[PDB]
Structure formats: structure tokens, C-alpha cells
Amino acid sequence: APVRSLNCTLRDSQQKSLVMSGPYELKALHLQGQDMEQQVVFSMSFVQGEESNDKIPVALGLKEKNLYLSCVLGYIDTNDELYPTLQLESVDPKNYPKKKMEKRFVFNKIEINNKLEFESAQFPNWYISTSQAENMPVFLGGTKGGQDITDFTMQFVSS
């Protein structure tokens, strides 16, 4: 393209790591030592979308997996109308990433020090979220304050 990118892991504000849960899902849990190898490496690209002084548009791919997080209307857990849902979408490595990511792939990275939130650019007020419980899916949530975990820290891996 080229697109500006870095590789990183993410941990939620409770220190849970993100790992694969089947081929098309992530889950969060507190990890230990060598098992840390299980945490998922993201490739965070900076996309040409709507930048605020503190709303930096990004896409999140899963390094080496040809998968991207995307926000698409569907049905939600519940714990006719459609709601934003988090999907792990496989893509043609030939064309991704790109500065012009389709809207479903774009998150606004919000830096509330020293924490990051990732808001769906397509569906405002919906965030990459984890449950307080161990081993539950990563999902789009956080629409009501103080209910879900929507804060993360980033661990730089490489560029």
C-alpha cells in the first residue's frame, strides 16, 4: 500500500489475556508463564478514517491468521431488531490490510491513559469488550457504563 502498522497483544483492565476460542472467536482469561504463548498477536493498522485528537481510526488483524475483527449487525447473546456484533472475518492476504478498510473493520482507538478503548466506528457507543468472568468470548458491548470491561493495555510486540 503501504499501510502504517504495529504488532501487539492486548490485555483487558483486569489483566486477562486474549486467546483464540475456535477458528472465528476470541476469549479472555487470566494466563500464566509459558501459556502466555497462547495470547493472540494483533496487527494494528492505522487507517485513513475519521481522526480526532483522541480518536485514531485503526483496523485489527490477527497476525499470520488472515483474520480481522469486524463489526456487523446480527443477533446478540441477550445477557427482530439487529445489534452490532464482533466477528472474526477471514480475508484475502493479497488485499489486506489497506488504508481504505471497509467500514466494518474500523475501530476508533481512544487513549484514556494509560488505557485504550476501541469503539466501533460504524456503530458508535459499541466497544470491544470482555466479561469479568474467565473464558468468555470477546464481544461488542459497553453500551451501558460500568457493566462490561472496555479498557485495555497494549503490549508492543514488533513493527
Swiss-Prot record:
Q: How is it modified after translation?
A: Activation of the IL1B precursor involves a CASP1-catalyzed proteolytic cleavage. Processing and secretion are temporarily associated. (Microbial infection) Cleavage by S.pyogenes cysteine protease SpeB promotes its activation independently of CASP1.
| Entry keyword set | Cytokine, Cytoplasm, Inflammatory response, Lysosome, Mitogen, Pyrogen, Secreted
Tissue specificity note: Expressed in activated monocytes/macrophages (at protein level).
- Chain ranges for the short sequence motif Involved in interaction with TMED10 C-terminus as given in the UniProt record: 118-131
On whether Secreted is a keyword of this UniProt record, the answer is: yes
Question: Impact of changing K65E on the protein?
Answer: Suppression of integrin binding. Markedly reduced activity
Q: What cystine pairs are annotated?
A: none
**Does the keyword section mention Secreted?**
yes
Result of altering K55E = Suppression of integrin binding. Markedly reduced activity
Q: Which residues are marked as site: Important for interaction with integrin?
A: K55, K63, K65, K94
GO cellular component terms, alphabetically, are: cytosol; extracellular region; extracellular space; lysosome; secretory granule
Annotated site location: Involved in receptor binding = R4
GO annotations under biological process? apoptotic process; astrocyte activation; cell-cell signaling; cellular response to interleukin-17; cellular response to lipopolysaccharide; cellular response to mechanical stimulus; cellular response to xenobiotic stimulus; cytokine-mediated signaling pathway
User: Which molecular-function annotations from GO does this UniProt entry contain?
Assistant: cytokine activity; integrin binding; interleukin-1 receptor binding; protein domain specific binding
Q: What controls how active this protein is? A: (Microbial infection) Cleavage by S.pyogenes cysteine protease SpeB promotes its activation independently of CASP1. SpeB-mediated maturation of IL1B plays a dual role depending on infection site: while IL1B inflammatory response prevents bacterial growth during invasive skin infections, it promotes streptococcal infection of the nasopharynx by disrupting colonization resistance mediated by the microbiota.
State the remark under miscellaneous.
The IL1B production occurs in 2 steps, each being controlled by different stimuli. First, inflammatory signals, such as LPS, stimulate the synthesis and promote the accumulation of cytosolic stores of pro-IL1B (priming). Then additional signals are required for inflammasome assembly, leading to CASP1 activation, pro-IL1B processing and eventually secretion of the active cytokine. IL1B processing and secretion are temporarily associated.
Similarity field: Belongs to the IL-1 family.
Q: What is its biological role? A: Potent pro-inflammatory cytokine. Initially discovered as the major endogenous pyrogen, induces prostaglandin synthesis, neutrophil influx and activation, T-cell activation and cytokine production, B-cell activation and antibody production, and fibroblast proliferation and collagen production. Promotes Th17 differentiation of T-cells. Synergizes with IL12/interleukin-12 to induce IFNG synthesis from T-helper 1 (Th1) cells. Plays a role in angiogenesis by inducing VEGF production synergistically with TNF and IL6.
Q: How does it assemble?
A: Monomer. In its precursor form, weakly interacts with full-length MEFV; the mature cytokine does not interact at all. Interacts with integrins ITGAV:ITGBV and ITGA5:ITGB1; integrin-binding is required for IL1B signaling. Interacts with cargo receptor TMED10; the interaction is direct and is required for the secretion of IL1B mature form. Interacts with HSP90AB1; the interaction facilitates cargo translocation into the ERGIC. Interacts with HSP90B1; the interaction facilitates cargo translocation into the ERGIC.
**Name of the molecule in the record:** Interleukin-1 beta
Query: Which gene is the coding source of this polypeptide chain?
Result: IL1B
The shown chain, on whole-protein numbering, covers: 117 to 269 of 269
